[PDB]
Amino acid sequence: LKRVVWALCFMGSLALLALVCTNRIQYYFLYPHVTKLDEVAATRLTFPAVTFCNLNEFRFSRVTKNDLYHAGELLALLNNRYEIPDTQTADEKQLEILQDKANFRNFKPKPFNMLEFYDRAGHDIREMLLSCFFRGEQCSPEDFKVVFTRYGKCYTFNAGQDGKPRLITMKGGTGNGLEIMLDIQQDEYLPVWGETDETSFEAGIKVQIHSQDEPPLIDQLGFGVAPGFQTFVSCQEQRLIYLPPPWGDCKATTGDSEFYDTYSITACRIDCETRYLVENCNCRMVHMPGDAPYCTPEQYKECADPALDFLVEKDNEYCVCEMPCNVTRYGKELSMVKIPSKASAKYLAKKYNKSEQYIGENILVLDIFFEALNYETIEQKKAYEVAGLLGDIGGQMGLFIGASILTVLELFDY
Amino acid sequence: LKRVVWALCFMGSLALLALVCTNRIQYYFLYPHVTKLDEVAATRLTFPAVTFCNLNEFRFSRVTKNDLYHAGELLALLNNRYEIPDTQTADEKQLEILQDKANFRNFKPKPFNMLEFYDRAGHDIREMLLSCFFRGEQCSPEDFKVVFTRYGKCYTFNAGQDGKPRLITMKGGTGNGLEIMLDIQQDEYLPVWGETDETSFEAGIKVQIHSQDEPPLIDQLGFGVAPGFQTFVSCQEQRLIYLPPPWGDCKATTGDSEFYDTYSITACRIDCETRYLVENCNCRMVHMPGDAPYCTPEQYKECADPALDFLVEKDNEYCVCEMPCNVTRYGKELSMVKIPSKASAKYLAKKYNKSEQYIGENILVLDIFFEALNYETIEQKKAYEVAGLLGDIGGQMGLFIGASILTVLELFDY
Amino acid sequence: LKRVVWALCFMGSLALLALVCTNRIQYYFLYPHVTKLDEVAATRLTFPAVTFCNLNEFRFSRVTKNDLYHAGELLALLNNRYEIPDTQTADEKQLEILQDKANFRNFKPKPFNMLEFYDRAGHDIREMLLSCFFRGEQCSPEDFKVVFTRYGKCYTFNAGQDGKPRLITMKGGTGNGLEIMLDIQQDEYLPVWGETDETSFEAGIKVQIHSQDEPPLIDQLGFGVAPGFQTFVSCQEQRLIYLPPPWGDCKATTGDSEFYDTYSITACRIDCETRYLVENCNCRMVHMPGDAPYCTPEQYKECADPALDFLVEKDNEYCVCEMPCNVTRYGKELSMVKIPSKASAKYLAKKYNKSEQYIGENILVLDIFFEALNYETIEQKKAYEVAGLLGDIGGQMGLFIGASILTVLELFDY
Ligand SMILES: [Cl-]
Ligand SMILES: [Cl-]
Ligand SMILES: [Cl-]
Q: How far apart are CA A62 and CA A217, in angstroms?
A: 26
Instruction: Spell out the residues 6+ positions from residue C339 whose beta carbon is closer than 8 angstroms to its own.
Output: B201, B202, B203, C228, C229, C230, C363, C364, C365
Q: How far apart are CA A131 and CA A180, in angstroms?
A: 5
Do B112 and B67 form a contact (C-beta atoms < 8 A)?
yes
- Asked if B397 and A400 touch (Cβ cutoff 8 Å), the reply is no
Going by C-beta distance under 8 Å and a sequence separation of 6 or more, which residues neighbour residue A43?
A170, C320
Q: How many helices (H) and strands (E) does chain B have?
A: 13, 14
- DSSP element (H, E) containing C145: strand C144-149
Q: What is the DSSP letter of C9?
A: H
For chain B, how are helix, strand and coil distributed in percent, rounded to 5? 35, 25, 40
User: Residue A250: CA atoms inside 13 Å, Cβ hemisphere, count?
Assistant: 18
Q: Do B91 and C229 touch (CB under 8 A)?
A: no
Computed from CA positions of residues B158, B160, B165, B170, in that sequence, does the dihedral angle turn out positive or negative?
positive
Residue whose C-alpha is closest to residue C197's, from C151, C153, C154 = C151
The answer to whether C132 touches C182, Cβ cutoff 8 Å, is: no
- Cα–chain center distance at C211: 9
Structural domains in chain C, CATH included, are 1-32+383-414 (1.10.287.770), 33-55+124-184+205-241+326-382 (2.60.470.10), 56-123+185-204 (1.10.3590.10), 242-325 (1.10.287.820)
Rounded distance between C-alpha atoms, residue C334 and residue B334, angstroms: 7
Three-state DSSP at C71 gives helix
Please state whether C404 falls in left (phi above 0), alpha (psi between -120 and 50) or beta. beta
- Minimum CA–CA partner of B24 in chain C: C387
Which H, E and C letters describe chain A, residue by residue? CHHHHHHHHHHHHHHHHHHHHHHHHHHHCCCCEEEEEEEECCCCEECCEEEEEECCCCECCCCCHHHHHHHCCCCCCCCCCCCCCCCCCCCCCHHHHHHHHCCCCCCCCCCCCHHHHHHHHCCCHHHHEEEEEECCEECCHHHEEEEEECCEEEEEECCCCCCCCCCEECCCEEEEEEEEEEECCHHHECCCCCCCCCCCCCECEEEEEECCCCCCCHHHHCEEECCCEEEEEEEEEEEEECCCCCCCCCECCCCCCCCCCCCCHHHHHHHHHHHHHHHHHCCECCCCCCCCCECCHHHHHHHHHHHHHHHHHCCCCCCCCCCECEEEEEEEEEEEEECCCHHHHHHHHHHCCCCHHHHHHHEEEEEEEEEEEEEEEEEEEECCCHHHHHHHHHHHHHHHCCCCHHHHHHHCCC
Residue A52 identity: F
Letter string b/e over residues B293-317, b meaning 16 or more CB atoms within 10 A of that residue's CB: ebbbbebbbebbbbbbeebbbebee
Distances in whole angstroms, Cα of residue C377 to Cα of each of A300, B90, C44, C330: 51, 53, 15, 12
What 3-state class would DSSP assign to B370?
strand
- A38 strand-pairing partners: A377
Closest CA to B156 of B227, B119, B207: B207
Name the phi and psi angles at A394, rounded to 5.
-70, -55
Round to whole Å and give the CA distance between A349 and C288. Answer: 36
Which of B102, B109, B64 is closest to B84 using CA atoms? B102
Ligand number with the minimum distance to the CA of A265: 1
All chains having 3 or more CB pairs closer than 8 angstroms to chain C: A, B
Whether A206 sits inside 8 A of B407 (CB atoms) is: no
Query: Whose CA is closest to A318, among A272, A378, A285, A382?
Result: A272
Q: Do the Cβ atoms of C153 and C118 come closer than 8 Å? A: yes
The Cα C6–Cα C188 span in angstroms is 95
Q: Give the whole-angstrom CA distance, residue A171 versus residue C268.
A: 12
H or E element at residue C13: helix C2-28
Q: For residue B334, which of C235, A223, C209, C369 has the smallest C-alpha distance?
A: A223
CB C127 within 8 A of CB C185: yes
Question: CB A80: neighbour CB atoms within 10 A?
Answer: 7
| Torsion-angle region of C290 (φ positive above 0: left; ψ -120 to 50: alpha; else: beta) | left
Q: How many other CB atoms are there within 10 angstroms of residue C141's CB atom?
A: 15
**Ligand 3 centroid to residue C149 C-alpha, Å:** 14
SS3 C336: strand
Return d(Cα A233, Cα B256) in angstroms, integer.
Answer: 44
Q: What is the C-alpha to C-alpha distance for residues B395 and B391, in angstroms, rounded to an integer? A: 6
Using a 10 angstrom Cβ sphere, with 0-12 exposed, 13-18 middle and 19 or more buried, the burial of residue A136 is middle
Residue B153 parent element (H or E): strand B152-157
The H or E element that residue C362 is part of is helix C356-362
Contact B295, B303 (CB under 8 A): yes
Query: After which residues are there C–N gaps above 2.5 Å in chain B?
Result: none
3-state secondary structure of B2: helix
Parallel, antiparallel, or unpaired: how do β-strands A173-183 and A45-46 relate?
unpaired
Using a CB-CB distance cutoff of 8 angstroms, which residues of chain A are in contact with residue B33?
none
Work out whether strand C49-54 and strand A363-382 pair parallel, antiparallel, or are unpaired: unpaired
Strand pairing report for A229-241 and A363-382 = parallel
Instruction: Work out the number of other CB atoms within 10 angstroms of the CB of residue B58.
Output: 24
Cα gap B183→B128, rounded to integer Å:
5
DSSP 8-state secondary structure symbol assigned to residue C322: P
B37: nearest CB among C37, C341, C350: C37
H or E, element range at C230:
strand C229-241
Q: How far apart are CA C276 and CA B250, in angstroms?
A: 52
Chain A interface test: which of B20, B230, B344 (most A C-beta within 10 Å): B344
Q: How many CB atoms lie within 10 A of CB A134?
A: 20
Q: Are B286 and B115 in contact (CB under 8 A)?
A: yes
Amino acid letter for position B46: T
Strand bridging mode A152-157 / A144-149: antiparallel
Resolution (A): 3.0
Write the Ramachandran bin of B345: left for phi over 0, alpha for psi from -120 to 50, otherwise beta.
alpha
Is the Cβ–Cβ distance between B175 and A312 less than 8 Å?
A: yes
Among B38, C186, C27, smallest CA distance to A386 is for: C27
Q: How many Å separate Cα A44 from the centre of its chain?
A: 23
Residues C335, B310: C-beta atoms closer than 8 Å:
no
CB atoms within 10 A of CB C221: 22
Q: Write the burial class of residue B215 (CB in 10 Å: 0-12 exposed, 13-18 middle, 19+ buried).
A: buried
Phi, psi of A324 (to 5 degrees): -75, 170
Calpha distance C207→C222 (Å, rounded): 5
Please choose, from the candidates C233, C253, C236, the residue with its C-alpha nearest in 3D space to the C-alpha of residue C244: C253
Distance of CA A394 to the CA centre of its chain: 50
Query: CA quadruple A256, A257, A261, A266: dihedral positive or negative?
Result: negative
**Could you give phi then psi for residue A121, rounded to 5 degrees?**
-80, -20
Give the span between the Cα atoms of B388 and C253, in whole angstroms. 35
Q: Give the closest of C34, C309, C336 to A381, CB-based.
A: C34
Which ligand is the nearest neighbour of the Cα of A321?
1
Short-list C192, C178, C87, CA closest to C138? C178
Q: How many residues does chain B have?
A: 414
**How far apart, in whole angstroms, are the C-alpha atoms of residue A32 and residue A27?**
8
CA–centroid distance, A75 to ligand 1, in Å, is 24
Closest partner residue to C395 among B6, B315, B395, by Cβ? B395
Q: How far apart, in whole angstroms, are the C-alpha atoms of residue B111 and residue A239?
A: 63
Q: Which residues surround ligand 2, an ion (CB under 5 A)?
A: B 269, 311, 319
Upper half-sphere CA count for residue A207 (Cβ side, 13 Å): 28
Taking CB atoms and an 8 Å limit, are C135 and B313 in contact across chains?
yes
Q: Give the single-character DSSP code of B241.
A: E
Cα–Cα dist A275/A259, whole Å: 10
